Write a protein that binds this ligand. Sequence first.
Ligand SMILES: CC(C)N1C=CC(C)(C)c2cc(C#Cc3ccc(C(=O)O)cc3)ccc21
Length: 135
Amino acid sequence: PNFSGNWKIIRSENFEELLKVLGVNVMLRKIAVAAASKPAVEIKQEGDTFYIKTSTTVRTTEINFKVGEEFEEQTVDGRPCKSLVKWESENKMVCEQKLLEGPKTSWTRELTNDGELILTMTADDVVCTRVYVRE
Ligand SMILES: CC(C)N1C=CC(C)(C)c2cc(C#Cc3ccc(C(=O)O)cc3)ccc21
């Protein structure tokens, strides 16, 4: 599927809990949660090549990767990692992360038949789920 476009958040579940179990300081956690409530998301996909920009004033993540080639990013709680994206199924990509020790973290993105984008972010047993619609 083509994920390209600007995406707008409509649901977030377990974001604060994810940060909480990862030990993020409560003062920083409240700033992170509030910033994450209204991110600006831009995706440009050309085959297996992805540009994914998620912007908030206090944290912008900008990754330009090819599916099946390793790249550097940060975990959700800000620790440097090596990431590797693969297609799990036809409409779902799964990213495995390894720290540059800690919780086992990952993220997934998929598109529904209606064109809603579902992001999950995991740390051990805690799963955060965020749903977006294309502008
Ligand atoms: C207070 C600031 C400086 N801060 C500090 C520490 C951590 C790393 C926990 C932090 C994470 C986010 C975040 C985020 C986020 C992740 C994903 C998405 C998304 O994909 O929509 C949106 C926001 C935003 C701020 C901080």
